[PDB]
């Protein structure tokens, strides 16, 4: 990378940006296989989403040379590169329901509170499924009839 940073800046992410950082989706709870002690397919350690184990090696064993850089194996989908990318590729999870971030809700004062002009207690009631909040009123339809 270039050696020239004027300054650093920080901000909020976005689901359309968090999908951009990611290389796969982890959809299985399982970690490494118990028997052979290789990572398990499509979980928190798998080689498909993250990176190969040893340097310049796929998963099934169809390539272990160094001659092939950057090819993606069509039998299991791992990519033969340095194993150091094993700590630079990030996963992503897609939640069937949207949760709130805890940092904007439990801080004092809650900024979510100040944006949505609630008491903090009632915001907590909404988040945790203990109180219904009325989102949108069809005013025009109510005045008409």
């Amino acid at each position: 990378d270039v050696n020239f940073f004027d300054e650093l800046r920080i901000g909020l992410a976005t689901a359309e940006d968090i999908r951009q950082w990611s290389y796969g989706e982890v959809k299985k709870p399982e970690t490494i296989n118990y028997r052979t002690l290789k990572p398990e397919k499509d979980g928190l350690f798998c080689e498909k989403i993250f990176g190969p184990t040893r340097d310049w090696e796929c998963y099934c064993g169809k390539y272990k040379r160094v001659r092939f850089k950057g090819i993606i194996c069509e039998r299991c989908g791992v990519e033969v590169t340095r194993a150091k990318v094993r700590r630079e590729r990030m996963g992503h999870i897609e939640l069937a329901a949207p949760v709130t971030h805890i940092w904007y809700f439990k801080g004092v004062p809650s900024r979510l509170g100040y944006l949505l002009d609630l008491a903090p207690k009632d915001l907590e009631k909404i988040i945790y499924f203990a109180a219904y909040v009325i989102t949108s009123v069809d005013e025009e339809m109510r005045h008409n009839e």
Partner: protein, 244 residues
């Protein structure tokens, strides 16, 4: 809801807060807040200003407040939460693995539950557990009881990797042990010039080892560099002439 189904809609949950923030427009509240600020009765007004600050932030940023409800969560790379196998056959892992696994579980189970169809109390309970789970993954013990894994030991959260004496911000300030270094007892030597110093030759052999190796394959005393390194390990009489 039954009386006026066509007239309002309102959700319980975090999905509700997302439709609320989306229905919310930032520029609209901002002007009214500034007018509140403009007016008198400041003690009541100060409260309107704390709002103004939080709100105007999102206007200047160019970042929508929509990014405060997560439709996806990132997973940290697999190495920064390693699971390495110890010497005695035991597995030694990091705590984040239990949290990510937990959120994955509660997520998959919730989605199949939506597929099957279910009562409202069961779906609302599963949503609740998902929100609380991801909440403890981002920052533990911030809402109710923390989570403990083995033996009533709180789990190190993901916000746990930033704060504290051992966090990532404190790391470079405390100091670490280096390479090419030693230490010993000092005696006075009143023979030395102000820029000289006296160095135990047994220690200055170890300290400069690689350089002695380069010069030692350069001379050709050792056929190969790897062999030469072996030579400096046996303190052979040829290495002192080179170490000078």
């Amino acid at each position: 809801v039954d009386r006026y189904g066509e007239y309002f809609t309102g959700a319980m949950g975090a999905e509700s807060i997302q439709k609320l923030i989306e229905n919310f427009d930032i520029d609209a509240e901002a002007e009214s807040l500034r007018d509140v600020i403009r007016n008198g009765k400041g003690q009541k007004k100060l409260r309107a200003l704390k709002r103004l600050k939080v709100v105007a932030a999102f206007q200047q940023s160019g970042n929508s407040p929509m990014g405060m409800v997560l439709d996806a969560v990132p997973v940290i790379p697999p190495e920064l939460r390693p699971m390495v196998q110890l010497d005695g056959g035991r597995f030694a892992t990091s705590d984040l693995n239990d949290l990510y696994r937990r959120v994955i579980n509660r997520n998959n189970r919730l989605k199949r539950l939506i597929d099957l169809g279910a009562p409202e109390i069961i779906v609302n309970n599963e949503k609740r557990m998902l929100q609380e789970s991801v909440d403890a993954l981002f920052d533990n013990g911030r809402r109710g009881r923390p989570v403990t894994g083995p033996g009533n030991r709180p789990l190190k959260s993901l916000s746990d990797l930033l704060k504290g004496k051992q966090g990532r911000f404190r790391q470079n300030l405390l100091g670490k042990r280096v390479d090419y270094s030693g230490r010993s007892v000092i005696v006075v030597g009143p023979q030395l010039k102000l820029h000289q110093c006296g160095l135990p030759k047994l220690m200055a052999l170890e300290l400069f080892k690689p350089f002695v190796m380069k010069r030692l394959v350069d001379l050709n005393h050792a056929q190969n560099i790897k062999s030469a390194k072996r030579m400096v390990e046996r303190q052979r009489p040829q290495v002192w002439d080179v170490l000078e």
